[PDB]
Each structure stands twice: as structure tokens, then as C-alpha cells.
Amino acid sequence: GGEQLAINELISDGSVVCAEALWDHVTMDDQELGFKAGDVIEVMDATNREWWWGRVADGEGWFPASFVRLRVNQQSSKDQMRTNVINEILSTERDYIKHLRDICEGYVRQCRKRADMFSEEQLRTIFGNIEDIYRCQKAFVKALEQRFNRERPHLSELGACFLEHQADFQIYSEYCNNHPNACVELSRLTKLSKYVYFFEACRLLQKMIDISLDGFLLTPVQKICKYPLQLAELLKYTHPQHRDFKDVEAALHAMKNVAQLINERKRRLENIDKIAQWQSSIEDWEGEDLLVRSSELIYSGELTRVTQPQAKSQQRMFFLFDHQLIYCKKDLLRRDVLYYKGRLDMDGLEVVDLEDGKDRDLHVSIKNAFRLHRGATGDSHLLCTRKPEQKQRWLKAFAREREQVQLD
């Protein structure tokens, strides 16, 4: 509670800065940090505009700052902490309204005057229902500000305001459903010089925030997915006997509901793309396309496999999808290039937790180990990690992939 500091000065102090994911981050890169919406992330390095270094219990890697919201708060001063969150919600709305204004006044208006460059179909594809969202959001912020208690901010009652606008937040569903198509059209136009100049003229005449058009257009998707995080931190600093408590709780649930649908569709849509992109990035691919059988990455990480013909240790990067487990080898001195080495079909397979000792089935020296046993046939595959927490996370991951596969 109190008056805030800048992120890099905190990280320069040795201070701990926590944030939470508003979107899932899907990734197969071992230097990047994947997470799910709602996860807590410690931010270690914010030198970059976008690609920050963060930590989870586990590890650790690069992640996009825009997928994440910083916690506002890092005797009756729990009031001050409540006020800080109320103030963040309010200013966040004010900023967002300016974004929506810049889109609608600066982009849509000019595009619509140019029937020669933009069809009505194109306008719907690119901008979606953004003008309706701008209209509801203007009203919402007004209703929000009228509830703000200047005298004593901590007393402000924000929950019922969210409740009153539930149905209006439902229109975000259509926006986010259309967003993938907006992006596709934007990429296409991005490659056309006359459109690049047009959008450049728009920018310059409206004097807009230093953000690209596709950055502007992601703005409603960030906002809807961010609310549950704001409402949870507000509730956190609201006592059960506060007038606003029950409404914030009901509103948190209502806003969770809407953002969970949006985040999931985005997650599935991105999983499909990362997979296709990852695959085409791998060297010496053999054996089919991931997307024939798979739709998401369950887990990845380094694993030692031992050869069966017989019988040596290969440290390989392993990638568990629904239904299949791929392994790859990292290039001599290009740690970001991998070479396809093989895969296994998880459908025949089942996990065998192997406690320590001598080997068995061929040889000896093995530690944080386990076997993927068939059952139908009789094949078996020895695998192991460097440290114990790693084996447990793999055992968790294998248990997670069978449970997705059951009622996929």
C-alpha cells in the first residue's frame, strides 16, 4: 500500500515483483516460460519492452509482458491497499477508453470513408464489433466513476457495477471470436504498401499512443481477460463485512466465466499454430504431422533416454503432446536448433514409476528413472532426469495427458 515504484527500479533493488497471467503462454522453447492464465509469475528481468525473464516454482524463462498483469500491491492500511486496486481499475478503464477512441475515431472512421480500399466485409473482419464495445465501455466507465468515493476510496462499491453490465460484457465474446480473422486480414494488408501508408497516415493524423494497429486490436482481448485478476485482488483487500464484498465475489465469478471461454479458445487456436510452427522448425522431420493426432503440448523438457538395441544414454529434448511423445537432439553450437530423432505413441503406453537401484532390462546405472511400458505388445523405454523434482513433474505430465485423452 502507498505510492508505487517503477518495475526496473524494484528489480534493481533486489525486490520481488509478482505478476499473474491473463492468458496462457504456450511454448516449446526451453528458454521460454510457458504458463496458464491465473498463474503467479515472479519477474526477474524487465530490460526488454516485451520479453521479460520470469520464474515459476519449476523454473524459469522468457515470456511476453503483455500476457501478464502486475499485482498492484507487491492496521487499517489494508484500506490503502484496497484503494490502490480501485485506483488501478479506474485508471486502467480510462487508458482503455482512450485506446477504443483512437481505434474508432482514428482508424474505423477513415477506413469507412475509403470504400475503394475497404469493403464493409473487410471492416467487419478487421474491427469486429469494436464500435459497440466502445459504446458500452463509455457507459461502464461513467457508472464506475460515479461509484468512486473521493473522500474515502476504499469504501467505493465497484462489484454491483460489474454485475449490472454482465450482458454487455457478453459482446466481448463475438469480438474475440472474430479476432483471429482480423489478424489474418491485417497480416495480408500488412504486405500491401498502399495499406501500409494508409494506416501510417491514420496514425499520424490522430496522434495515437505508441502502439501498432494489431496492438490496438488486441486491447479488448487483454482487457476482458484482465478483469478477473483485478477483481480477485480487489476482493483480496475487501473484508467480508464490506458493503462491496458479495458483489465483488459474484462479479469475480461472472467475469471469470466470460474470460475463461475467451482464454480457452485463444489457447486451442494458438496450440494448433505453435505446433505447426514448431514442427516446420525442426530438422530432419520424419514420420507424419503432429496435427494428425495431436492438438496440444502437455509438457516438455530434457530427458535422458537409453538405447535398447543397446544401450547408451542420450540427453534429448522431449515433447509430450496428447497421444504422442517426440524426442529431438540439440545442434552442436546452435542451442535453438533441434533435430528430430523419433517419437512414441502414448495410446499403447503406460507409466512405470521406478525407484532407484541398479538398472535391470539391459544394464545398471540409473536414477530419477521410469519406464513407458506398452502392455498390448511388450516394449518398454527407459527414461530419467537430472533432479527429483523433474521426475515428479514428468509423472504429473504423463498423468495429465491420459486425462486429457480420455474425454478430449
Please give the angle made by the CA atoms of 313, 316 and 317, to the nearest 5 degrees: 160
Query: What 8-state DSSP symbol labels residue 66?
Result: G
Domain extents for the chain?
A: 1-73, 74-287, 288-408
CATH number of 288-408: 2.30.29.30
275 SS3 class: helix
Q: First CA to last CA across the chain, in angstroms?
A: 44
Going by C-beta distance under 8 Å and a sequence separation of 6 or more, which residues neighbour residue 124? 178
DSSP state of 153: G
Which of 363, 330, 362, 326 lies closest to 345, judged by CA? 326
Residue numbers followed by a gap, the chain, C–N over 2.5 Å: 74
Q: How far apart are CA 408 and CA 400, in angstroms?
A: 12
Query: Can you read off the three cell numbers belonging to residue 310?
Result: 543397446
Cell of 16: 520481488
Annotated resolution, angstroms: 2.2
Residues 69 and 80 sit within 8 Å (Cβ to Cβ):
no
Matching residue, cell 472474430: 178
Report the CATH fold assignment for 74-287: Dbl Homology Domain; Chain A (1.20.900)
Continuous segment of H or E residues that includes residue 342 = strand 338-345
Examine residue 311 and say whether the peptide bond preceding it is cis (omega within 30 degrees of 0).
yes
Picking from 249, 207, 267, 215, the residue whose alpha carbon sits closest to that of residue 21 is: 267
Burial of 326 (0-12, 13-18, 19+ CB in 10 A): buried
Method of determination used here: X-ray
1-73 — its CATH code?
2.30.30.40
What is the C-alpha separation between 167 and 255, in angstroms, rounded? 11
Task: Of 197, 196, 169, give the one whose Cα is nearest residue 262.
Answer: 169
Torsion sign, CA atoms 316, 320, 325, 328: negative
